[PDB]
Scaffold this motif. Structure first.
Motif, short mmCIF file in Angstrom:
data_model
loop_
_atom_site.label_atom_id
_atom_site.label_comp_id
_atom_site.label_asym_id
_atom_site.label_seq_id
_atom_site.Cartn_x
_atom_site.Cartn_y
_atom_site.Cartn_z
N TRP A 264 -24.51 -22.55 -47.25
CA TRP A 264 -25.05 -21.31 -46.72
C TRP A 264 -23.97 -20.25 -46.62
CZ3 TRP A 264 -30.13 -22.18 -46.30
CH2 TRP A 264 -30.55 -23.50 -46.08
N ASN A 265 -22.73 -20.68 -46.42
CA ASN A 265 -21.61 -19.79 -46.16
C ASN A 265 -21.26 -19.00 -47.42
OD1 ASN A 265 -20.54 -19.50 -43.59
ND2 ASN A 265 -18.54 -20.29 -44.22
N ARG A 266 -20.34 -18.06 -47.27
CA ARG A 266 -20.03 -17.37 -48.52
C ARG A 266 -18.63 -17.74 -49.00
NH1 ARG A 266 -18.12 -12.96 -51.30
NH2 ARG A 266 -19.67 -11.76 -52.49
N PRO A 267 -18.49 -18.18 -50.25
CA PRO A 267 -17.18 -18.64 -50.72
C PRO A 267 -16.24 -17.49 -51.01
CG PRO A 267 -18.74 -18.74 -52.50
CD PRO A 267 -19.51 -18.26 -51.30
N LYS A 268 -14.95 -17.76 -50.83
CA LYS A 268 -13.92 -16.75 -50.98
C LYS A 268 -13.68 -16.44 -52.45
CE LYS A 268 -10.27 -16.17 -47.87
NZ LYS A 268 -9.16 -16.89 -47.19
N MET A 269 -13.18 -15.24 -52.71
CA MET A 269 -12.97 -14.75 -54.05
C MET A 269 -11.61 -15.18 -54.58
SD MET A 269 -14.18 -11.27 -55.69
CE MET A 269 -13.59 -10.06 -54.51
N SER A 270 -11.54 -15.42 -55.88
CA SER A 270 -10.29 -15.70 -56.57
C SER A 270 -9.58 -14.40 -56.91
CB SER A 270 -10.54 -16.50 -57.84
OG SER A 270 -10.78 -15.62 -58.93
N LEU A 271 -8.27 -14.52 -57.17
CA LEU A 271 -7.46 -13.34 -57.49
C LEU A 271 -7.91 -12.69 -58.78
CD1 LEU A 271 -4.95 -11.48 -57.29
CD2 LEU A 271 -3.66 -13.33 -58.33
N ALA A 272 -8.30 -13.50 -59.77
CA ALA A 272 -8.69 -12.97 -61.07
C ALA A 272 -9.91 -12.06 -60.98
CB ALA A 272 -8.95 -14.11 -62.05
N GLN A 273 -10.76 -12.28 -59.99
CA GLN A 273 -11.90 -11.40 -59.82
C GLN A 273 -11.49 -10.10 -59.14
OE1 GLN A 273 -13.96 -14.77 -57.57
NE2 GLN A 273 -15.54 -14.16 -59.04
N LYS A 274 -10.66 -10.20 -58.10
CA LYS A 274 -10.22 -9.01 -57.37
C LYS A 274 -9.45 -8.07 -58.28
CE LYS A 274 -7.92 -11.22 -54.20
NZ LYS A 274 -8.19 -12.68 -54.31
N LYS A 275 -8.55 -8.63 -59.08
CA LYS A 275 -7.80 -7.84 -60.05
C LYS A 275 -8.68 -7.29 -61.16
CE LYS A 275 -5.21 -9.99 -62.73
NZ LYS A 275 -6.14 -9.52 -63.80
N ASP A 276 -9.85 -7.88 -61.37
CA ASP A 276 -10.76 -7.36 -62.39
C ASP A 276 -11.86 -6.49 -61.80
OD1 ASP A 276 -10.89 -9.73 -65.17
OD2 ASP A 276 -9.88 -7.80 -64.91
N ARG A 277 -12.15 -6.63 -60.50
CA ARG A 277 -13.07 -5.69 -59.88
C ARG A 277 -12.50 -4.28 -59.91
NH1 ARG A 277 -15.20 -6.49 -53.82
NH2 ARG A 277 -16.31 -8.23 -54.79
N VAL A 278 -11.20 -4.15 -59.64
CA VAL A 278 -10.58 -2.84 -59.68
C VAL A 278 -10.49 -2.35 -61.11
CG1 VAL A 278 -8.34 -3.98 -59.57
CG2 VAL A 278 -8.50 -1.55 -59.06
N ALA A 279 -10.36 -3.26 -62.07
CA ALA A 279 -10.34 -2.85 -63.47
C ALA A 279 -11.70 -2.37 -63.92
CB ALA A 279 -9.85 -3.99 -64.35
#
Lengths: 293, 104, 159, 205
Positions: A264-279
């Motif tokens: 039910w909880n929400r899983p934490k994000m990996s670095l590769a996504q965070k660095k690509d969300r800004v991209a």
RNA sequence: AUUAGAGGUCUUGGGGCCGAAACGAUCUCAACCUAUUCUCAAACUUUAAAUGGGUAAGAAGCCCGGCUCGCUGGUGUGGAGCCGGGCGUGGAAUGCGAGUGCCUAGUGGGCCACUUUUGGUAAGCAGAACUGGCGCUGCGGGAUGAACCGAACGCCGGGU
RNA sequence: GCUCUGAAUGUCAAAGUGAAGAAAUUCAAUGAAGCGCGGGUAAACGGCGGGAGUAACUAUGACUCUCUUAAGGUAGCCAA
RNA sequence: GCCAGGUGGGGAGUUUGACUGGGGCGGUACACCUGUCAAACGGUAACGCAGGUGUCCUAAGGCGAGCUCAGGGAGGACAGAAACCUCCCGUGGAGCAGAAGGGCAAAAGCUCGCUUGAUCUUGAUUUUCAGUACGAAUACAGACCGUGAAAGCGGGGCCUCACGAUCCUUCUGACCUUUUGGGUUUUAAGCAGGAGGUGUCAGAAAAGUUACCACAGGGAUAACUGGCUUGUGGCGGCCAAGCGUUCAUAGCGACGUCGCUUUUUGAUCCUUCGAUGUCGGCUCUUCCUAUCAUUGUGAAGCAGAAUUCACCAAGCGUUG
RNA sequence: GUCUACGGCCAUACCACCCUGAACGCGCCCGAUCUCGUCUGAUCUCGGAAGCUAAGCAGGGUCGGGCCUGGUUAGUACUUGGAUGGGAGACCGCCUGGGAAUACCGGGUGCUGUAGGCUU
RNA sequence: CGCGGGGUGGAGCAGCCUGGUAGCUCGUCGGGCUCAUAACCCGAAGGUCGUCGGUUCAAAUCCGGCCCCCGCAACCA
RNA sequence: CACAUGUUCC
RNA sequence: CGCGGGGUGGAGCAGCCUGGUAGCUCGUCGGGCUCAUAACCCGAAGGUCGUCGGUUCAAAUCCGGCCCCCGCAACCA
């Protein structure tokens, strides 16, 4: 303007307090005096009676301090009462006396001290103290752990305490805070305490709402009508509930059923996504900048 | 400083804590027939002038206040000395100061 | 000259570290000390009572007497060409279990382990610590690549 | 007047600044550290010259005051009144002491504060000048006239930094190209790639 | 402690300006605020060495078994003290025989040097830290020399 | 400093006086000279001021104000 | 005649601190405390630096509970820059008797309630240290108590300073011991614990002067030369804003800076106190040049005269 | 997967803003007869269960601040020991050993003990 | 240290004795007066009787202790 | 009881 | 240089020691008296305690630097 109070330098110097203090759950000024043992005792445990009151439950645990985290030796809750004899009203003064009784009886039954140290069977509400018996194993001793609750007269942390000392624990205490100690003339009145232990103050509220107004009675004691608790059976309910505890206070854990292993909880994000969300964000900014121009 | 005129403390004779009356200690009159006084006069009598040192370099501008306790029990009747640190002003049972009240 | 105050020159010796002021963690109290434990002293400013002197902040000793909130330590103090084994009473707050001993106690375990073990094998294995020897003769593979040549750079006045 | 600068020349004592303990110190003779067209942006004065020291000695506040005027005066005639900008990069903070004699001799000889001096290390910039690049030899002569106002020897070096920045001149324009350096008047703000993203939207719009 | 511009807002204001008059507006000049920027601290400090100060590197240690206690206690629990029995590859390197008790003279003006260092413009000045010197000590060298460099001494021959 | 005055007197010693006490002793009263109080005295020792203002141009200050002490240096005389 | 009180430098005896860039004067560095010096254990000097102390407190001591401070913003009748009220922000930017440092946020702070652990008594230990005291302090133990529901906490002040021997006096302590051949009773002496104080603070009872001077000594210690130093005094360079009608440098030269010299005074105390004769002048010699004149010369804002500036140069002069 | 009670470590755990929270639980919330305490049932105390995740709280997000941990600064600064080394000095270089700190650039954003639930 | 006597309207002072009565003079203020400050006169405003306690039908009064001042006399840490 | 003074061309 | 005291309406001084809250004489100004001026009578104005910053509920007062003014001392060869 004003000089910004919480600036970068303010956080660079900031020293947080302890986690259990940052949530308002522990009084380390009082915990230190409660849980530490004198050094010439050498792992002689300092048991304390942790009585906690919530909105819908009462948690009474007994524990001793340890360096990896203080260890629960025995616990008891308010919602274990509908198993025995208490349908509704599991946060009043009479509920606390049951939980303190249920904690005390369960403990000595786990230490094999059930057949000795009976305590106070007929509830009276006066000063009772379990003196140790020679030859037999010495009485259990613990201390009340009130916590952040204001210890005024009649507080329910003293109600459960009464349930424990009648159960056979030798908790040092006095009668200044029980419901029935006169404040102005400074003497105790055992009869008045017996009322609250057997829930009579609630009956005199429900009997107060018969001749006054039924609508508020049909709103103040809703589950009491859902369980048919009239002011006539209340004393003999807890009196029966006290017997049904002093004969089988053992706990029985629910079956730990196989879980379906989902999230039910929400899983934490990996670095590769965070660095690509800004991209993606940076690209979607410029591609929306060429349209309007 | 201000001390109350009464105190509940340990009575040596009655062996426990008991109320005591508190008064200030005063030097008794120096007897003329003590040993040191009779010896001193036999030294001064006759010629030779002063034969013992007279102190002259007074430096301390105070004393040590002593309190003469008295047991107020009708059968104890014991007194004992008790001292406090040096202070210039000193009174017995001065009016107890108040917290947060207008001053002029 | 200097003054003989008890805390003369302890501006940084008893000061709490940065971002660590305040209430002390409770495991500093619920830590036990028997007799004869290798115990070191590190004065803590937050607890004024039971403080040791500044000449023991750092010194390590052994316990010989344990009271409610304090221990007695037998520590060495050098005083002008002689050592004195003097007894001091310190509260628990200025006290840590010194780990300058247990790594030898760990070495005693394997020394008692490797003496009982390998005895039935009939072999003789080393027990004493030998110091770091000179390293043995070995090869160095330099496969393919050639060692890069180094050169001292010229002078560039950086200011 | 005051003692010769041969007396207070070496960094002899601990740094003894004007504070709660050393009070009654006269004002430093140098008060104006920056002069010329100091209200000038970073992209018109690319050249920057230095007077780097080569000794560990003390420079008086008067030598700092005197050398400032002589370098200022020569740059006025040479590069107009607004073709340069001068920073004295030493602030006199060490207080020197004088043991004024009126007979007492050396009984209780802790001196009174005489004046203020500036301590300087080896390879440290004393006074720096930014100006237009074509006025290269004008500055290198101006600082040369300033060396005679200071004790001892010091080198004159032309830095590689663009203006009074800490960024090399060759890398300067390409950083202004990709908007890595935002000109903040006499200085420039270095924008990293670490802030919140919305301000990156701001600069690119 | 301290230098300089920037960007802010009427955040208060200094004379202002069409404005009776308006945070309506005016260039401003100030402080005030926000990012920056130059320079410092024996009696400032988040960080933070080098050198240094304790302690440990076993037989007084380990590991079993059992007693005693008025101490400690839910609990022959806790701890301490006793016995008894079993384990030597002597548990880092190097060097060296140690321990211990009496009686006790002289001394209690010191001085110099590398490094650190306080006052002083400085001094063959005054005052300290560490080590070694001189004093108490000749010898070879520095022409000369209490202290520098080498090296310390029974009386001699050879070599170096 | 010196001197004169006094039961009009505050203090003070021995002794005497009175009382209490088994007694040593204690206490009280009385209690000289001297000091204190009050006069006299400087050819006794000695001492004998400060700040502003003000006259036909200027300067100056006869006068004025103020603070002040036991008196506030007068007659004279002077870089002796 | 004998006692008593006054008076009594007429006379007698004796004292008239120490530290110390000589002694005096002045300070207190003489007993203590904080920061620094001090060189990352501790220790560490100077008439080194910046300060403090000879107190104050019946609560400013002891518990427990409840609280959150400084300051700032926005609001609210008079009310304003500042009275009171409310919300928000608030790691201490406040407070805790005092000097400073350390410490402290459901507290050590602030506010209430109840109180006397600021009591009685053995030792052990720490600090200064000789490893002696006094002071101060820490751990206990035995009592009696306070507070709290309780665990606990408290034998003064959150910690680092706020104090004092023998002898004597004084007071309290006991069904106390001795008072002399025994008994009684006063008295007196003991034993124990406080207090009356020595600040020169490990604790004499203490004013001057000497040029009429004395003795023991001291170059451990001044006044003179001589040495090291050169602040100061004197003398000389560098840079060159300016002066010089114009013109930086004929002659000068600010702001700065670099030296030299021992014909000024300082600083220092090394040599001399079982003595080195301590101001000037007179007399007479030699030496130095940083040159006034003279010989030879360079440069001038050198027309001539006179006068400046600089070089070689101390041979010869420099008076009444 | 996760929560409550009691905790240990005491920011990788804080702070700002945004998003989502099944079940239990924690809360909010409804009341003042009794207990208790206020100027005021706001707080504290007490009796409950109509409503609700809006908040607290939990998980997550931010080219986030801080913090944590590396790189870099840098064998630089400084330093032990040594020389009849350099230099008028100030100070520097070498030999022998040890060896930092900002700026700057990265990575990370709570682990966990005991007892008890929920997801059955 | 011992003895004496002082403490009181705003300053000073009386009254304390042989106890129930707190007044006088100066100064502030209203009136009447005088050309006038004045002189003179009247009225009102002015006192925990230095502080406490004991004791009395009543105490500033009597009794004990404390505080300040003055005079004389004392003087072993 | 005290009270000093004077502007003058005509 | 060291040390000591002082700075309060126009003038000269208190008050300070011992913290609250500002005076004295003179002078000025206005009104009256007189033909007039001075004297005299009535009434008013005039400093906020050298300056700056601190302690304290409250500071002319207490504390600190700075500024002015004055005094004492500065001796033995």
């Amino acid at each position: 303007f004003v000089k910004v109070v919480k600036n970068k330098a303010y956080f660079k110097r900031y020293q947080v307090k302890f986690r259990r203090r940052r949530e308002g759950k522990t009084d380390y000024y009082a915990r230190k005096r409660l849980v530490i043992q004198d050094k010439n005792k050498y792992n002689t445990p300092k048991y304390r009676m942790i009585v906690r009151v919530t909105n819908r439950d009462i948690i009474c645990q007994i524990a001793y301090a340890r360096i990896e985290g203080d260890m629960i030796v025995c616990a008891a809750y308010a919602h274990e009462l509908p198993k025995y004899g208490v349908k509704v009203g599991l946060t009043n003064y009479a509920a606390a006396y049951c939980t303190g009784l249920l904690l005390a009886r369960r403990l000595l039954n786990r230490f094999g001290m059930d057949k000795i140290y009976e305590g106070q069977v007929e509830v009276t509400g006066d000063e009772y103290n379990v003196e140790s018996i020679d030859g037999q194993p010495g009485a259990f001793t613990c201390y009340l752990d009130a916590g952040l609750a204001r210890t005024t007269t009649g507080n329910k942390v003293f109600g459960a305490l009464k349930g424990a000392v009648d159960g056979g624990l030798s908790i040092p205490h006095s009668t200044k805070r029980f419901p029935g100690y006169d404040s102005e003339s400074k003497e105790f009145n055992a009869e008045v305490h017996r009322k609250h232990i057997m829930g009579q103050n609630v009956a005199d509220y429900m009997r107060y709402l018969m001749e006054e107004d039924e609508d508020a009675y049909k709103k103040q004691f809703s589950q009491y009508i859902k369980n048919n608790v009239t002011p006539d059976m209340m004393e003999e309910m807890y009196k029966k509930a006290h017997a049904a505890i002093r004969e089988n206070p053992v706990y029985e854990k629910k079956p730990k059923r196989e879980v379906k292993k989902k999230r039910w909880n929400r899983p934490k994000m990996s670095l590769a996504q965070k660095k690509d969300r800004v991209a993606q964000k940076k690209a979607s900014f410029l591609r929306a900048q060429e349209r309007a121009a | 400083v201000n001390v109350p005129k009464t105190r509940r403390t340990f009575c040596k004779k009655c062996g426990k804590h008991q109320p005591h009356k508190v008064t200030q200690y005063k030097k008794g009159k120096d007897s003329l027939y003590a040993q040191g006084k009779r010896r001193y006069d036999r030294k001064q009598s006759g010629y030779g002038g002063q034969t013992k040192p007279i102190f002259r370099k007074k430096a301390k501008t105070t004393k040590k206040i002593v309190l003469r306790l008295e047991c107020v029990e009708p059968n104890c009747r014991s007194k004992r000395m008790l001292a406090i640190k040096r202070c210039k002003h000193f009174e017995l049972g001065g009016d107890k100061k108040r917290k947060g009240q207008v001053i002029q | 000259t200097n003054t003989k105050g008890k805390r003369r020159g302890t501006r940084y010796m008893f000061s709490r570290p940065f971002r660590k002021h305040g209430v002390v963690p409770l495991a500093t109290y619920m830590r036990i000390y028997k007799k004869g434990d290798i115990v070191d002293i590190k004065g803590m400013g937050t607890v004024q009572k039971g403080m040791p002197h500044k000449c023991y902040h750092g010194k390590t000793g052994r316990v010989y007497n344990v009271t409610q909130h304090a221990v007695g330590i037998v520590v060495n103090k050098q005083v002008k060409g002689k050592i004195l084994a003097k007894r001091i009473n310190v509260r628990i707050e200025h006290i840590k279990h010194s780990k300058s001993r247990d790594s030898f106690l760990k070495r005693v375990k394997e020394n008692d382990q490797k003496k009982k073990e390998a005895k039935e094998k009939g072999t003789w294995v080393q027990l004493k610590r030998q110091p770091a020897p000179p390293r043995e003769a070995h090869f160095v593979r330099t496969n393919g690549k050639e060692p890069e040549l180094l050169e001292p750079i010229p002078y560039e006045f950086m200011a | 007047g005051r003692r010769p600068a041969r007396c207070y020349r070496y960094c002899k004592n601990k740094p003894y600044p004007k504070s709660r303990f050393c009070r009654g110190v006269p004002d430093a003779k140098i008060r104006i550290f920056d002069l010329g067209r100091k209200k000038a942006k970073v992209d018109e004065f690319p050249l920057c010259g230095h007077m780097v020291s080569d000794e560990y000695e003390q420079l008086s506040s008067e030598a700092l005051e005197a050398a400032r005027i002589c370098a200022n005066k020569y740059m006025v005639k040479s590069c107009g009144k607004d073709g340069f900008h001068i920073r004295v990069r030493l602030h006199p903070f060490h207080v020197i002491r004088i043991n004024k004699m009126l007979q007492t001799g050396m009984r209780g000889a802790f001196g009174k504060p005489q004046g203020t001096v500036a301590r300087v290390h080896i390879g440290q910039v004393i006074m720096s000048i930014r100006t237009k690049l074509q006025n290269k030899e004008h500055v290198v002569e101006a600082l040369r006239r300033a060396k005679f106002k200071f004790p001892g020897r010091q080198k004159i070096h032309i830095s590689k930094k663009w203006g009074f920045t800490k960024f090399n001149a060759d890398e300067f324009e390409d950083m202004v190209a990709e908007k890595r350096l935002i000109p903040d008047g006499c200085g420039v703000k270095y924008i990293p790639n670490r802030g919140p993203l919305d301000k990156w939207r701001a600069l690119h719009s």
